[PDB]
């Protein structure tokens, strides 16, 4: 196989928004998307962004202090989805942000949807024009764990994934 899907312009539009931040005032800094969920719409002809499911950085201040947990909750092994998440982590000087694509490809997910997803990773990153780092898990425990996110970092120079878990 090679590249299951060709692109519907939707992913690029939302990705572009994340890349420039699309923010100035305090009002929209908190409306910036820490994480976004991507999936392929029915017939799987096109790849798009899911309106219903997304994670905002403003949430940590607004009401939820663990964005990387909500993501775990809204990503059942029951459904296979594509996602972009901002690392937003501290390494003993200050904190930056690594763009990471999160692949959720649970083996146990319904075969019909999951199989196209699995085969489409080359096609999905094909439009990603090579992505920096990636995290992939097929189960809740790997997605849930702090260490998997920290593995990317290196793990010997990171005391605080979110300023508290490590």
């Amino acid at each position: 196989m090679a590249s299951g899907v060709a692109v519907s312009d939707g992913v690029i539009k939302v990705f572009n928004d994340m890349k420039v931040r699309k923010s100035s005032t305090p009002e929209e800094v908190k409306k910036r998307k820490k994480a976004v969920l991507f999936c392929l719409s029915e017939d799987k002809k096109n790849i798009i962004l899911e309106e219903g499911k997304e994670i905002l950085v403003g949430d940590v201040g607004q009401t939820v202090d663990d964005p990387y947990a909500t993501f775990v909750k809204m990503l059942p092994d029951k459904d296979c989805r594509y996602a972009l998440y901002d690392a937003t982590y501290e390494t003993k000087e200050s904190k930056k942000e690594d763009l990471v694509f999160i692949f959720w490809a649970p083996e146990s997910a319904p075969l019909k949807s999951k199989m196209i997803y699995a085969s489409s990773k080359d096609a999905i990153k094909k439009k990603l024009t090579g992505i920096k780092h990636e995290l992939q898990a097929n189960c809740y425990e790997e997605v849930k764990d702090r260490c998997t996110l920290a593995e990317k970092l290196g793990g010997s120079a990171v005391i605080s994934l979110e300023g508290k878990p490590l």
Binding site: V20, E93, G154, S156
Partner: protein, 374 residues
């Protein structure tokens, strides 16, 4: 957040870094490499998009040709340099250049032709509202709160000696030495290999960098130390490899830093770098030589090896005539001192008065940068 946080971009041969004002150190550090097709690309389907900047390119070194945008503190190829600035703002910092003004660092005695042109690119290519050019050696002396003295700067890619009196660098006291930080990493791997460890590919070169900050040590006395090393005992020191094996380093703990001090191990007939600092002092005015000894500052990249401060005192004492006091200035934040000096004085309010703006460049032109400094 909002007024003009000041984006600082620090450039050198390698291991470049950037951040925001009010910080105690830079937020992100990345490799300086650019890659395009080499050896016809390595087979099956060549043409694609290739111009990789960052550490993603490091893996891709075998299939992409790497060109250095910066060669030992200066920029020869601008096309590679532009990619780095694009990538730093949009991909590494992840902050819009438009809200925050950018400060660019420079090597001491930077050529005049380059200085006018770099300013030119910021104003038209990236439309940046404000920018400033600073010298890494000047800031490090400045950071200690002392304006009179001599600074030996360990850059992330190049080491320069720049004695500074009243903000002015001495043209007749500055020399360029090419061994600083990235080069040592290559060297450390090279001696590690000699003992009996396998390094044959550029991919695992990066791994020794981790080794460098954790395991590089400087001995109080090199020859006495060598005799101790043969018996082994407690000399061997543990280290973590991603796979699980631990590579034990015993007499290599002190020998690696020694290459700067004793180039002969490399195969160089050249004088040691500490000695090189001494030559600059000899050339300098005799009356201020005693002051210079008490004004010495150690900053940057690889000066953070433990025991280095102890070694410096010994060699300088042997090199110096005698009968006088030698004092070394040691700032806690010496690794980030170069970046730190630039970060703090970029947003106070009275630094607003002093900024070189885009609007000014349009009027006077390239000539403006020479005119407002001092």
């Amino acid at each position: 957040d909002d007024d003009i946080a000041a984006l600082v971009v620090d450039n050198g041969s390698g291991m470049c870094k950037a951040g925001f004002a009010g910080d105690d150190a830079p937020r992100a550090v990345f490799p300086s490499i650019v890659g395009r097709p080499r050896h016809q690309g390595v087979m099956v389907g060549m043409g694609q998009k290739d111009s990789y900047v960052g550490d993603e390119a490091q893996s891709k070194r075998g299939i992409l040709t790497l060109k250095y945008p910066i060669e030992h503190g200066i920029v020869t190829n601008w096309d590679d340099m532009e990619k780095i600035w694009h990538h730093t703002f949009y991909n590494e910092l992840r902050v819009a250049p438009e809200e925050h003004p950018v400060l660019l660092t420079e090597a001491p005695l930077n050529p005049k032709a380059n200085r006018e042109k770099m300013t030119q690119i910021m104003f038209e290519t990236f439309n940046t509202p404000a920018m400033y050019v600073a010298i890494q050696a000047v800031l490090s002396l400045y950071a200690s709160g002392r304006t009179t003295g001599i600074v030996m700067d360990s850059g992330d890619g190049v080491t320069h000696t720049v004695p500074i009196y009243e903000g002015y660098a001495l043209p007749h006291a500055i020399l360029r030495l090419d061994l600083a930080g990235r080069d040592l990493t290559d060297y450390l791997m090279k001696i590690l290999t000699e003992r009996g460890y396998s390094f044959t590919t550029t991919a695992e070169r990066e791994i020794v960098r981790d080794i460098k900050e954790k395991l590089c040590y400087v001995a109080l006395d090199f020859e006495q130390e060598m005799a101790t090393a043969a018996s082994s005992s407690s000399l061997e020191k543990s280290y973590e490899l991603p796979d699980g094996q631990v590579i034990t380093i015993g007499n290599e703990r002190f020998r690696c830093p020694e290459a700067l001090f004793q180039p002969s191990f490399l195969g160089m007939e050249s004088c040691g770098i500490h000695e090189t600092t001494f030559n600059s002092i000899m050339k300098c005015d005799v009356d201020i030589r005693k002051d210079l000894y008490a004004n010495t500052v150690l900053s940057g990249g690889t000066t953070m090896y433990p025991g280095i401060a102890d070694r410096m005192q010994k060699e300088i004492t042997a090199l110096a005539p005698s009968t006088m006091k030698i004092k070394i200035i040691a700032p806690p934040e010496r690794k980030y001192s170069v970046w730190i000096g630039g970060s703090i004085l970029a947003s106070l309010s009275t630094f607003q008065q002093m900024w070189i703006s885009k609007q000014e460049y349009d009027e006077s032109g390239p000539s403006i940068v020479h005119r407002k400094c001092f």
